[PDB]
Amino acid sequence: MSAEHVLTMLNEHEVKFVDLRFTDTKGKEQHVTIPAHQVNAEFFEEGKMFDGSSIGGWKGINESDMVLMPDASTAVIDPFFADSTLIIRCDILEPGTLQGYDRDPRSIAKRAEDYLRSTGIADTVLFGPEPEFFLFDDIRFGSSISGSHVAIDDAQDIRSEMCLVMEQMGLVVEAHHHEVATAGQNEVATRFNTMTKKADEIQIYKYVVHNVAHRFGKTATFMPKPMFGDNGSGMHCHMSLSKNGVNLFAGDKYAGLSEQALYYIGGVIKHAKAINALANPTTNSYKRLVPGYEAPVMLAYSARNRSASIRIPVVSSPKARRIEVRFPDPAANPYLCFAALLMAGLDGIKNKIHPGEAMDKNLFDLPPEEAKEIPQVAGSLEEALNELDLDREFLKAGGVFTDEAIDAYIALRREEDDRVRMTPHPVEFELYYSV
Amino acid sequence: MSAEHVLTMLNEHEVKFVDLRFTDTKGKEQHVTIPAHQVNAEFFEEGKMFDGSSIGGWKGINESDMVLMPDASTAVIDPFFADSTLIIRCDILEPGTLQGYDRDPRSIAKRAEDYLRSTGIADTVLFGPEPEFFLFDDIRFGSSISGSHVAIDDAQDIRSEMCLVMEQMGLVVEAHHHEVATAGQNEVATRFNTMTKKADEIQIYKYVVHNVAHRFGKTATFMPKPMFGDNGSGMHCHMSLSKNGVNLFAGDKYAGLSEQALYYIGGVIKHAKAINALANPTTNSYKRLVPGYEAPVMLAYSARNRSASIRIPVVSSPKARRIEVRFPDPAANPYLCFAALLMAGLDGIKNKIHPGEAMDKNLFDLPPEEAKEIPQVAGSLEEALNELDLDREFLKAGGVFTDEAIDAYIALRREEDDRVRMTPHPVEFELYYSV
Amino acid sequence: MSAEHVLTMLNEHEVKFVDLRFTDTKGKEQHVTIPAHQVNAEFFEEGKMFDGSSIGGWKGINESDMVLMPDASTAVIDPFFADSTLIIRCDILEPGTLQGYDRDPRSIAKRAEDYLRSTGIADTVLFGPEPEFFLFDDIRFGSSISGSHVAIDDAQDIRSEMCLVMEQMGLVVEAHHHEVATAGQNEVATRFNTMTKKADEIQIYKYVVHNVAHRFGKTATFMPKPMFGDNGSGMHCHMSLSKNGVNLFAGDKYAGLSEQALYYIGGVIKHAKAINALANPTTNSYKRLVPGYEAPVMLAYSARNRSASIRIPVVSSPKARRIEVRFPDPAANPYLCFAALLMAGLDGIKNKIHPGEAMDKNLFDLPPEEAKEIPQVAGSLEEALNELDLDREFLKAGGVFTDEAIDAYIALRREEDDRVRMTPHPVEFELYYSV
């Protein structure tokens, strides 16, 4: 899809504004809106000059502006704006070299896919995530010097019209279930795409969910554990690799899974804590990866066991043979999370890393003199960030991740880890106020 | 002081009730009240049969009762009860052997002192703690399934009458300062005693503080960090060793400190994380031992530096030469905390452990490529409990701590660590709800 | 009715979503919604992969997914959804064998009918239930640690539009009476169908009632005893058996009733407590089956007496000769309740079980030295579940009910029986608080 069709779309829909959207390293979606008449043919080869100081982690105060280069293939009409707006996802480029910024999540995802095609291991990667969210009637939260509080006050109509708006915005939806047990927990499923396209679709997904909830007077959250005791919000990721239109994950070994796939799982298992730094980036994220019950915490693979973090779904077709990793959560930055998973898998394939043996077991149900034995995902955000700091190498292969970018990411996550670490918690008053 | 004087006190003061008090492994103070006429001469050689199942960590459901044996030297009139009551601190004894219970904090403290006298290193130990508390006007806290909250609403009269009641109850008070900067933070200082006597005095201290506050319509808390940004509540512990009436900590080395004292500091530094499991037993306790600013976090000794955890106070007298360790907090169980510090020091003396060199530096003010280098106290309650689980040996010397007692303590602290770990925190809503 | 007509209906009505509905062992109605464009011709021969772990009683955590196979003959447009939806009832199938799941109520009902046709006793069974509900203006209920409460605040328009919506959804309605005496108690009658069709109609009935009430700002309940003193909600079930288009219940004996029918009644009477475990599955259900007054509690048959649980309605036609059992309540799972009644009747026919003599008496009005003598329905849910545990055999004939399925059902009902048993009741405070 080219720029000419975008200008045609501008004239056709009577678009008044164009909303250029990009993503911070935090995963938050930033935007700049320009009038539709400022979009010309030339606009698609110079982009828009932006002040790259405001965003955290990015260019500092002395190193100056960046370039917003739109991707014309990502153009879509915004359903929620009163004045007809066209959304275009943009890359952040260095104004001189006019190349992808080192600290740009979208550029990093594109680099990861390019490295995939470069290494010759496969031609494309298919990512299918399953982001789950919570719908609440109301919420009030706050934290002053003299205490803290949160209060959460808990339909088909909301989800069905979410699905309709998501299909307006180019997503292909394929199920809309409520979770049977958990109050407010909903999940819309969607069709698999390539990494960067699917990450863009995850940004559109979250946008639609948030805005459609506000229309119905609700509040949606993609926060991995918003409520005690009730099951957390996850984002299970199905990976496949394809070369010239055939799966590399289809073979003859355990559950019809290929040798290349087994090394992919090995690579994911080995670096899973460095991955956890990117896939599980919040401190809330480790209240659902808790040691013990109902946790996708055990770093092993099994088609039967559902206490293993890595599942091998059973499909009556060699053309759909994938691995599902279940530890990532919807608070992840889709670009960085997906790039991390792909690079871990490629490092596993490159180094012939063998995952071991399938745990057709009942984990959790194992006595805790063997619960200790199995590799586990990171126990806290500090542990994950430390493991990332020590295990940078697999992310730097092919220059996808810069040392500088990893450093900036770690620092930006630590400034939030520390704020959580040093605020007093209400449960600590219940337990220790009298003591 | 004998039983006969206690019966004399019963007749003299017209005591109606006798309150037998003991301490859980949590540090909470349990009591059984008997009528004054049930106290006979025979009562001081059989004690009182107690059901030892209710308390957590102690004897289970199949192993049955314990014995409350009063210590007649700990008798004191309760100032707060309308019906004249005599408080007596009791030990928990096994009904058969009539020996100190293995999971009894007071018995463990007595065993630690007995082992001290057995090893011949010194004759007695002098402990001077400095417990600090917070006075608030009001507080409301709570944690349901649908959220959590805390709200804290912030005088000379209260402290001065606290000091008067503490001197009624046999404490020798020696200062009553308000903390200049921190709202509500107060501190009453007291004279040094031996380990077990001082631990009993710390229990009386906390009792008096709590009850006198309630009289004035206030709420006192010994919780290490009840409020954000404002400095935490600590309990700095001054240790001295004496043999036949002379300090073993008085010598000719750094700041007039003896060789035996240097090995004591070495032993405290080496095992400081295993100690932290007992001296810093709450998860709140590590919000004041935070990496960085104003933390007694650096495991080194210095007479000048006040970022070192271990201080060497300067006194114009060889008869008062002590080491002050500043990481313990007032939520500690005084018996277990003091026993741990003494045993670490004795293991340091026994194994000739050299602490190294005095850090006449400015810590925190050090660049964080050397902040990393220095030994640190435990970063979280999990780390401290794991280090305790691995470093049991120094506590088991002379059979002071049983493996069974250490196991029960660790399990009982973990069941609270886990409850804190899996509840959602209000600050995590502020940071990640939208994300 | 085939799949082709369903795809035609999708195009005709401009259906946007398809709602696949199934029933737990609890009787609760679960659903998965897919977009209308995901329904293809192939979708009706593979179904939809579902995670069968969430539902209680069904496949555990290690045994993995199930298949939703739609029944194209059960397709109907949902009247309450804003986005035009097509409801299809689905069976749960094992993904391998592609056969009916053992713990699936709908599959069990189909198996019961298949066993009926297999044994050659009859060709089809006609079930006519009479589910009654309560309409309230408002209700508030709750149960915390510090008490419990319920408060119920009590038209032709509601029922008449209920009847209209039920006829939209393929039910044939045939009366809409309010109960003369009981506040809020309403009843819509419907035409007889076969077992599985009628159970599907009972699910549609309950759905329509609940949703139409919410439209009018009311609350409907199918709970057997929502209010003290006032008569409970029942679901009287009329059974008939047909072979090649003639009743087997039409004959020459008592009230024109056939020999086969008499053994059917005998079989129902013998196993009525095992049946009560399925037809009366709640603890509330035995507050309307109370020993004494106005209870369909007496296990005997009579055309005249209305204190007998089994009635023989008088009809001026041999083509309508049925037996009405009056103990079942609308909280029952229609599939399991109906399967249980049919299997008890078939075991009665197979074993020539004679019911005895008609009780043309006045029961309740009998002195309680003969009230004791007559067989009674179960007195509590525990008794019913114990009798079911002992009397499994009649349900296992022809493999309709698995031992595993019965075990799972019993366990799932017991976890609710126990929660009711151990919560303190307000009336027990009225009677025994002072005592």
Residue numbers in the entry:
A (entry chain A), B (entry chain A), C (entry chain A): 1 to 154, 189 to 469
What does the paper behind this entry write?
Two of the others were essentially at Nyquist resolution (catalase and glutamine synthetase at 3.4 Å), with only PaaZ and the 70S ribosome at 0.9 Nyquist.
